[PDB]
Amino acid sequence: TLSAEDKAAVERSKMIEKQLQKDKQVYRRTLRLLLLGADNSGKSTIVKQMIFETKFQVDKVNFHMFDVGGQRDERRKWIQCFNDVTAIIFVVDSSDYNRLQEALNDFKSIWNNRWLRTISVILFLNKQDLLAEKVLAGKSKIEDYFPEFARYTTPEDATPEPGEDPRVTRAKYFIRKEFVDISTASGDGRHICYPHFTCAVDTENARRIFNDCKDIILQMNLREYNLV
Amino acid sequence: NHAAGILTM
Amino acid sequence: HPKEYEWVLIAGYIIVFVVALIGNVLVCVAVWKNHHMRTVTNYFIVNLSLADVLVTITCLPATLVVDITETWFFGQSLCKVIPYLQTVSVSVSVLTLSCIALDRWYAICHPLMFKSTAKRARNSIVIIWIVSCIIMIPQAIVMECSTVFFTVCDERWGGEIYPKMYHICFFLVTYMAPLCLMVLAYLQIFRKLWEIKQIRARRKTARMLMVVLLVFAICYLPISILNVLKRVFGMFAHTEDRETVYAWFTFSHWLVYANSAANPIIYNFLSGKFREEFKAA
Amino acid sequence: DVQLVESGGGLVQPGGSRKLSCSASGFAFSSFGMHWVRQAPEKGLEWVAYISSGSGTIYYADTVKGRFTISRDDPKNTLFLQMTSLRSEDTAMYYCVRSIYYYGSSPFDFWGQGTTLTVSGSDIVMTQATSSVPVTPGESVSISCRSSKSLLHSNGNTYLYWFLQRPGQSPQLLIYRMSNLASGVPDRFSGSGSGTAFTLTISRLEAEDVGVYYCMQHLEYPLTFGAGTKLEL
Amino acid sequence: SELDQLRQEAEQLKNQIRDARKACADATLSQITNNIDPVGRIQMRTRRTLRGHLAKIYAMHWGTDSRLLVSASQDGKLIIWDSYTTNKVHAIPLRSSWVMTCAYAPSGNYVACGGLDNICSIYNLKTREGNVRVSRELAGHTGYLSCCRFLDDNQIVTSSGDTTCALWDIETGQQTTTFTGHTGDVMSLSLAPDTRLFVSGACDASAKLWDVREGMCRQTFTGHESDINAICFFPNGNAFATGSDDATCRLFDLRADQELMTYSHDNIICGITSVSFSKSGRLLLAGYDDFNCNVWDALKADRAGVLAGHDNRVSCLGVTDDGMAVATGSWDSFLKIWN
Amino acid sequence: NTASIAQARKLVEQLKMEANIDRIKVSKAAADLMAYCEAHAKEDPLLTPVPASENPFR
């Protein structure tokens, strides 16, 4: 019993719904990644070497990564918007010993957040070359900033890359243990942390993010199929 | 035929 | 006159009857009552549970009274309509097990081609029901209630060229090509799923998926090889041992109803998430 | 700027065939329903065709159903009317009329410029009993347009439109749905009435308001126009 | 030196206003509204359900004629619905997908939206070309902006998360007045019915009453303990109700300059995301994080019914201007109408 | 460090400007809220439910 103009209005609404379902088919297959990090960490050099938003592709899969960093040091309130992202890419400047404890406290504040109780963190310990130079030079110790390093020795379950000193490997795995301690001591089962070591002139990062988002979506699907 | 009338499935 | 073999047979029939009925109706009313469990995964599960109640109420007591009395009471109308419903419900439950295995293979071995849609689930349920109703119509034309001078409800074709081909393609439809699709899907999910708390937690998944594959692949072997021996190669014509044939057939039918009873245990109630989402309803 | 321009006119002998093209410049053509409305060399307006947005709905008039065919090309921004089996009662001037339909929209708002084509029943009869009123500049005039069926739909809207055609130009939407003024009209035009009696009133009539005033219905297709009342000075 | 004397003067002034607020409180709202009859049970059922969005709905706003509403979602789309027939009048795609606010102009012409890109985009719906075109983009804020409210077709008040509000003139683009004084992220505002003074609530557990015409902060209200993330005026413009993260709403009064009533229940632990009154001022509705709204009898403070039906967090809520519906929009991509 | 002195002087000026407003008693303000809530009681389609002939969301 609709009129003529009412029938044409319903036809307009149906065409709008067709366009919205096409955009849903495009939107469901994209992967969002919230990028976070300190000021001297060089997250922008990761993004530029592979500006809020940035879209890139690996193997016809569309990644859509945004660095929200135009606001001030209170990240406590806008982080509710990012509770359905696929992963959080955290970047650490792992060569400045003075500013590393602040990075550890920031990672503890991101891990135990009440809106991020499901979101997995891909953790990039950036700037490895400066760390190697600082360890093999022997000018600035790590035991002055971390007193447990006097009693840390490399474990047998590690595989050092060929060409580097064992002291460099001990320092690298000490930093990695210091972040995965905060990773494993909370939220066991819902989300995990994937640490990678990364240089500045390295260019294989899109493959690493691809494998880690593969694992994240695999674990989410093993959970949501009543299958785990 | 002995096996006659037994329903399948 | 019942023998000693049927002293436990009727008890074993009624226990799987009440277990299958109770388990399947609680799964369907748990999905219907709750609203967090109406995902894209639980469409195939509730279709499988409707197929399972149709198997356990349309196939079980009719073939029980035939497998105890060898006497057909129901006349030609039910002798035409009942085996069609039986083969339709069995083939629906088998084909929806195949679609469950294909969907799990899409969602584990290919997680970044976001394939499992709700439109795809609706299309696959419609294709299962349509193909299963169209394939089983020769179980409805040629059924006759013949008395020889108890009375049988059996097939009678023209010639020995058509029913052999029909029952060998029926054997490929209701048992074999589902088994090849299920073996492919669950073997590749086993290869993918084989920090150590996570590895020891996702190894139990591959173990229980091989349990699901084995419970399907064992509980449909003897009835299907018996049908392809009887209806095709013309065995069980001249036997000195016919009661052994009769016990073989009633045991294979009990294996089918045991599988249709065990489906909502190994598909739903053996997962912690379904228990934690079941007690909220 | 917003304009529609059509071409494809000229002499056609009867029984022939001809295609008319209306090209759009300056608006989002893919979201506007498009009408074709013709005018005889001395009579008033009548409706000939309609195609929706997305081409999912097409309507024709009772005179040209089956021998006219309308279509649209959305990437090339054109509207086509392919006419076969022409009679001698198709000699006219054809106008290409845009119209958009949503809640609170303004249909029939922009009219084209028209091609001159020379050729050598349970619908609503909108009668307009006056035909020529001699007017002076600076006086209130009222123009009456009686329907036969009641145009007041159940959802409150009274689908009656008032158009103005000046001598030598194309028609222009004055009032849509019996009271709402069109965007760009002076505030001295106003419409009133109910159900089957409607009226237009003009206060302080200027010299640029002479012309013919048409009343269209829009309750149900075919949209039937009125005979038009001339305002001779 | 002088800074200690300045801090002591500030402390003595705060003590003076505390004693002055204490001297002007003789009874409470619950001791005057004890004799009136209560409301009783309220059963409001979902009439329309509007399903078009792809992600979480973040804000909505009813048009001034109580029929059309705009809703903004996190997939980067405004959708304008005709709520009587659930038709989609418009679908506007945004430049940046992170939108935290929404507004409908009181003329029906414009629609504003903003978010994590620090920019208030103002869209013009009634064009001569049939499409929705970005009329302009206001950009002077230093943080994300959380609420936008139209005064008329030419000026708009925006509250951003860099402890500031601003009054923009759309015809030029530069902000004409900047309201500062907060010490935390301003999360929501609401204008008076006369639009001569508005009120704004922040994360420093305080709400402030600003004068639009002059430009100075008039009064501050400190009653809460956590971040205020919803605020709305009582309909005569002499009270307002705030919603916070400590699971309690409360009703402050402007002339008595202090808090009158606290709406809370011990089985409620999650924070409030939306607050708006009703047309009389007797139903303080509230949207919660536990996926359902609650209707509070706003004179005797007892609860009077719930509006359950959402699967996820209720993020926005609004009452029409004739008072004949309540639209709640939540994070499961649904708006729902109740009356 | 004079910017802290300017901010403190601005804050105390803000406080003494907020201290000199006239306040009515809470009893009268509660009475006026009650009077407005009971003088517009008949015009509320959420408090007093309207019949389904005048309810357009039916």
Side-chain angles (χ1 to χ4, degrees), chain A residues 1-38 40-47 49-50 52-59 61-72 75 77-92 94-95 97 99-101 103-128 130-132 134-138 140-147 149-155 158-160 162-187 189-200 202-203 205-228, chain B, chain C residues 2 4-5 8 10-21 23-66 68-70 72-146 148 150-155 157-159 162-196 198-275 278-281, chain D residues 1-41 44-61 63-68 70-72 74-75 77-81 83-88 90-112 114-129 131-138 140-168 170-182 184-186 188-198 200-203 205 207 209-219 221-229 231-233, chain E residues 1 3 6 10-15 17-34 36 38-40 42 44 46-94 96-170 172-173 175-195 197-212 215 217-252 254 256-264 268-299 301 303-339, chain F residues 2-12 14-19 21 23-41 43-52 55-58:
Chain A
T1 175
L2 312 175
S3 167
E5 309 207 18
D6 209 318
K7 284 204 281 287
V10 176
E11 186 173 340
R12 185 190 206 271
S13 153
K14 291 308 184 177
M15 287 210 59
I16 281 176
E17 287 184 5
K18 281 182 193 164
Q19 176 54 53
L20 265 62
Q21 288 176 171
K22 282 190 187 173
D23 268 311
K24 187 178 189 170
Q25 291 308 309
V26 172
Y27 167 78
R28 198 186 75 252
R29 297 168 149 86
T30 196
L31 298 188
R32 277 89 58 195
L33 311 164
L34 167 67
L35 166 81
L36 287 155
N40 60 339
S41 41
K43 34 174 186 166
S44 275
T45 203
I46 286 176
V47 184
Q49 188 178 231
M50 76 189 175
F52 289 0
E53 279 148 321
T54 299
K55 307 192 69 77
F56 67 101
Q57 289 195 356
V58 192
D59 283 7
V61 186
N62 298 313
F63 294 116
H64 176 60
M65 160 189 316
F66 24 77
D67 168 57
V68 173
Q71 283 83 247
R72 73 192 199 279
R75 65 180 63 181
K77 263 304 185 183
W78 51 260
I79 205 163
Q80 307 181 345
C81 317
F82 310 121
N83 83 309
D84 54 4
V85 290
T86 291
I88 290 180
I89 296 177
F90 193 88
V91 187
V92 181
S94 165
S95 85
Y97 293 130
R99 299 206 46 176
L100 191 49
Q101 186 67 227
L104 282 163
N105 289 330
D106 196 12
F107 186 45
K108 184 140 53 199
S109 190
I110 285 185
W111 195 249
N112 313 276
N113 206 296
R114 86 169 182 274
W115 299 111
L116 312 176
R117 287 212 178 278
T118 318
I119 311 296
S120 319
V121 169
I122 307 167
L123 168 67
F124 282 109
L125 298 143
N126 203 299
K127 291 179 183 183
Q128 278 305 307
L130 318 178
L131 168 60
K134 284 184 70 176
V135 179
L136 68 88
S140 87
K141 313 300 152 284
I142 317 170
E143 69 154 19
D144 301 358
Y145 310 98
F146 295 93
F149 190 78
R151 59 195 72 101
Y152 185 81
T153 316
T154 318
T159 310
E164 61 200 19
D165 307 0
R167 307 183 301 268
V168 182
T169 307
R170 182 166 69 110
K172 278 169 60 171
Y173 280 90
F174 175 65
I175 307 303
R176 185 177 160 177
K177 189 257 294 179
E178 279 294 326
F179 283 95
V180 295
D181 256 8
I182 313 178
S183 86
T184 73
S186 161
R190 297 182 311 260
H191 50 88
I192 51 177
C193 162
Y194 306 95
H196 313 270
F197 290 98
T198 303
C199 297
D202 184 24
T203 173
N205 292 313
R207 191 62 51 176
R208 288 164 160 154
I209 300 172
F210 183 72
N211 308 346
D212 295 2
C213 294
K214 226 184 200 171
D215 194 15
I216 285 156
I217 296 176
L218 187 138
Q219 185 63 230
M220 173 192 309
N221 279 342
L222 261 69
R223 185 175 319 128
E224 290 180 342
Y225 271 53
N226 324 300
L227 196 40
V228 71
Chain B
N1 184 45
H2 295 287
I6 35 185
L7 291 180
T8 178
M9 295 304 176
Chain C
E4 180 60 12
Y5 291 99
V8 297
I10 308 146
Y13 263 55
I14 59 155
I15 55 183
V16 299
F17 192 87
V18 304
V19 165
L21 262 186
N24 285 275
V25 297
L26 301 186
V27 172
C28 307
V29 305
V31 169
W32 168 53
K33 167 182 318 300
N34 201 302
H35 271 57
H36 279 61
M37 314 205 314
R38 309 184 180 188
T39 333
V40 75
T41 311
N42 280 101
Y43 287 168
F44 289 116
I45 286 174
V46 302
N47 176 81
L48 167 67
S49 280
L50 301 185
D52 276 305
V53 289
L54 260 71
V55 163
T56 57
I57 78 173
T58 65
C59 317
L60 199 142
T63 207
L64 169 59
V65 79
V66 175
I68 296 311
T69 73
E70 51 173 331
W72 183 256
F73 295 118
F74 305 133
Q76 202 163 354
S77 59
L78 291 203
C79 179
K80 285 252 178 189
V81 80
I82 286 287
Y84 178 74
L85 292 201
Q86 292 181 158
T87 62
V88 154
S89 300
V90 170
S91 91
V92 165
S93 73
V94 172
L95 290 176
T96 195
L97 290 192
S98 277
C99 285
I100 278 175
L102 187 59
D103 184 68
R104 288 178 175 175
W105 179 78
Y106 272 150
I108 294 183
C109 307
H110 283 83
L112 257 72
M113 41 179 290
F114 290 80
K115 201 83 148 178
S116 162
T117 317
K119 182 223 70 163
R120 188 196 189 87
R122 188 203 65 202
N123 289 9
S124 298
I125 287 178
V126 170
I127 285 174
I128 281 173
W129 273 106
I130 286 301
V131 173
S132 62
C133 293
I134 295 313
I135 187 65
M136 299 298 163
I137 52 166
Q139 291 282 128
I141 296 173
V142 308
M143 280 306 179
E144 315 166 17
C145 169
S146 158
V148 281
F150 209 60
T151 313
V152 307
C153 182
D154 215 313
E155 278 191 12
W157 288 58
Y162 287 110
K164 317 214 310 183
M165 283 316 128
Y166 176 66
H167 282 141
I168 198 163
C169 76
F170 163 75
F171 170 73
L172 288 155
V173 159
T174 197
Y175 176 66
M176 189 52 65
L179 200 64
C180 311
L181 172 61
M182 201 168 312
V183 158
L184 278 187
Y186 286 132
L187 204 79
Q188 289 195 331
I189 298 171
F190 186 86
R191 276 176 185 273
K192 198 87 187 300
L193 306 192
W194 261 65
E195 70 179 2
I196 69 153
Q198 193 197 28
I199 279 185
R200 297 297 169 172
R202 75 156 56 156
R203 195 165 286 211
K204 275 293 171 193
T205 299
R207 174 192 325 273
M208 179 137 46
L209 288 183
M210 292 310 272
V211 162
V212 166
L213 165 70
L214 269 196
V215 165
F216 171 64
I218 277 178
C219 294
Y220 272 74
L221 184 60
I223 177 65
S224 304
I225 73 171
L226 270 194
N227 270 26
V228 82
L229 279 179
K230 163 194 166 168
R231 297 287 191 185
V232 176
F233 288 140
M235 188 153 209
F236 308 134
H238 310 332
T239 73
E240 313 207 320
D241 49 356
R242 56 160 322 275
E243 75 292 340
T244 321
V245 175
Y246 215 77
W248 276 123
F249 269 95
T250 178
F251 183 62
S252 312
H253 298 125
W254 185 80
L255 268 182
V256 176
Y257 308 136
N259 166 262
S260 278
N263 277 345
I265 287 183
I266 60 183
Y267 272 69
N268 300 327
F269 285 140
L270 287 185
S271 86
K273 183 177 172 304
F274 194 76
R275 302 146 147 176
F278 179 74
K279 288 161 187 175
Chain D
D1 212 14
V2 188
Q3 68 181 35
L4 291 152
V5 54
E6 44 261 9
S7 172
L11 265 296
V12 161
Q13 277 167 179
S17 283
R18 180 67 87 149
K19 194 172 189 165
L20 306 150
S21 283
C22 171
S23 67
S25 169
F27 56 93
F29 185 78
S30 157
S31 51
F32 273 57
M34 301 287 294
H35 295 244
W36 273 91
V37 164
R38 91 174 156 213
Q39 169 173 344
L45 303 183
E46 59 177 355
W47 183 72
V48 297
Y50 158 75
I51 181 165
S52 173
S53 89
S55 317
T57 292
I58 297 177
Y59 289 105
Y60 292 92
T63 308
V64 302
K65 197 157 197 153
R67 46 187 195 98
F68 282 14
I70 193 183
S71 203
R72 67 188 309 176
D74 290 340
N77 282 3
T78 45
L79 192 69
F80 301 114
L81 190 85
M83 304 174 306
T84 181
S85 305
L86 268 69
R87 329 200 194 275
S88 41
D90 291 8
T91 166
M93 184 172 193
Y94 282 67
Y95 295 125
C96 165
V97 181
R98 66 172 211 171
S99 87
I100 180 164
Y101 295 108
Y102 53 88
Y103 167 66
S105 65
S106 156
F108 282 74
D109 40 358
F110 200 77
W111 281 50
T115 81
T116 315
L117 175 69
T118 309
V119 173
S120 280
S122 89
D123 47 16
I124 308 168
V125 185
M126 313 288 292
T127 177
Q128 202 165 324
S131 282
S132 46
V133 294
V135 306
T136 180
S140 75
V141 187
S142 87
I143 297 162
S144 45
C145 166
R146 322 173 319 98
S147 160
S148 69
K149 200 180 159 187
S150 78
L151 290 168
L152 197 141
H153 201 261
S154 89
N155 46 34
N157 299 146
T158 313
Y159 299 105
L160 165 126
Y161 291 65
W162 277 88
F163 297 114
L164 165 67
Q165 172 179 284
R166 283 176 184 88
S170 87
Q172 171 183 356
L173 172 68
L174 275 188
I175 288 178
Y176 65 101
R177 298 185 193 102
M178 192 201 56
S179 49
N180 304 115
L181 270 80
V185 187
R188 50 183 201 265
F189 290 100
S190 51
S192 319
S194 313
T196 73
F198 310 92
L200 179 98
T201 168
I202 308 165
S203 44
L205 173 137
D209 288 5
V210 300
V212 297
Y213 292 85
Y214 298 109
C215 55
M216 194 195 62
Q217 69 94 12
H218 207 295
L219 181 51
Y221 300 91
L223 319 180
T224 43
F225 281 69
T229 314
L231 262 69
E232 187 253 319
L233 206 160
Chain E
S1 83
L3 175 143
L6 266 288
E11 193 62 40
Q12 185 275 299
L13 274 166
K14 268 186 287 320
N15 261 28
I17 77 173
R18 188 176 48 85
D19 288 19
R21 288 180 181 186
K22 181 71 172 181
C24 289
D26 318 306
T28 182
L29 182 54
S30 200
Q31 288 184 1
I32 304 189
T33 64
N34 76 319
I36 60 167
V39 167
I42 289 187
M44 290 154 52
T46 296
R47 314 293 194 182
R48 303 310 205 280
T49 297
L50 316 157
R51 327 161 183 271
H53 286 294
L54 313 181
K56 319 172 295 180
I57 294 178
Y58 267 21
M60 47 76 57
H61 196 72
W62 279 93
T64 186
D65 66 327
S66 169
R67 175 164 182 166
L68 300 143
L69 75 154
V70 56
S71 73
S73 43
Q74 285 268 284
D75 61 317
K77 259 171 202 307
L78 293 157
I79 295 181
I80 298 176
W81 318 80
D82 161 46
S83 56
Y84 281 9
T85 63
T86 75
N87 283 317
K88 291 172 196 53
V89 175
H90 285 113
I92 306 157
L94 306 186
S96 90
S97 158
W98 309 105
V99 44
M100 305 177 65
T101 179
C102 207
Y104 214 106
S107 279
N109 287 293
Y110 297 96
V111 158
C113 67
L116 282 168
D117 50 352
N118 310 331
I119 285 187
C120 197
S121 309
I122 293 185
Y123 294 86
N124 172 33
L125 302 170
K126 291 180 177 180
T127 29
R128 273 302 291 276
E129 299 145 26
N131 52 354
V132 190
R133 222 188 64 249
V134 193
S135 162
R136 77 155 55 240
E137 283 169 336
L138 309 162
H141 272 317
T142 318
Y144 74 108
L145 56 95
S146 42
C147 195
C148 303
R149 280 301 183 260
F150 263 91
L151 263 73
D152 60 330
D153 271 351
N154 205 19
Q155 53 194 358
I156 174 177
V157 162
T158 316
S159 87
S160 48
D162 59 317
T163 80
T164 199
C165 302
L167 169 63
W168 301 92
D169 186 312
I170 312 167
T172 79
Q175 48 185 38
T176 56
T177 316
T178 316
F179 305 111
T180 58
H182 270 302
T183 84
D185 303 344
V186 185
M187 300 298 298
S188 290
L189 60 90
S190 201
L191 284 146
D194 52 307
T195 62
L197 51 87
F198 76 121
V199 79
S200 59
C203 303
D204 66 321
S206 71
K208 272 168 162 308
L209 184 88
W210 316 89
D211 201 318
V212 187
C217 175
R218 199 65 63 110
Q219 287 163 21
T220 176
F221 297 104
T222 41
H224 276 291
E225 281 133 19
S226 314
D227 322 328
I228 294 178
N229 40 357
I231 197 166
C232 172
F233 253 94
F234 187 87
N236 63 1
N238 291 330
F240 64 101
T242 54
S244 294
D245 267 28
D246 56 344
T248 169
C249 309
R250 48 192 72 196
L251 179 137
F252 306 95
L254 274 72
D257 199 12
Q258 66 182 280
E259 185 189 334
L260 302 188
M261 182 148 279
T262 297
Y263 307 90
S264 86
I268 290 172
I269 59 171
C270 48
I272 287 96
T273 48
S274 313
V275 157
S276 64
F277 271 98
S278 162
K279 198 189 188 306
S280 308
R282 198 168 157 80
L283 292 196
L284 179 61
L285 277 86
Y288 285 81
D289 285 307
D290 55 25
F291 315 156
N292 54 72
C293 306
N294 281 51
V295 181
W296 297 84
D297 162 83
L299 281 198
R303 209 205 297 190
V306 307
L307 321 171
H310 279 300
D311 303 351
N312 214 323
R313 168 196 211 240
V314 169
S315 53
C316 46
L317 175 139
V319 165
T320 77
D321 308 356
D322 51 356
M324 214 167 283
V326 166
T328 78
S330 85
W331 277 9
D332 54 340
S333 299
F334 292 144
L335 292 166
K336 283 191 180 186
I337 318 288
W338 319 71
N339 60 339
Chain F
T2 319
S4 159
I5 297 311
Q7 177 216 49
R9 172 161 283 111
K10 177 260 201 193
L11 177 143
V12 304
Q14 171 71 32
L15 272 179
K16 51 197 159 61
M17 188 274 275
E18 286 179 32
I21 49 164
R23 304 179 179 91
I24 65 174
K25 312 184 118 188
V26 168
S27 72
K28 190 185 168 186
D32 285 8
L33 261 71
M34 192 187 61
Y36 184 85
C37 274
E38 77 174 18
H40 284 236
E43 319 182 16
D44 200 355
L46 291 166
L47 181 83
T48 297
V50 282
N55 171 84
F57 285 95
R58 61 181 168 256

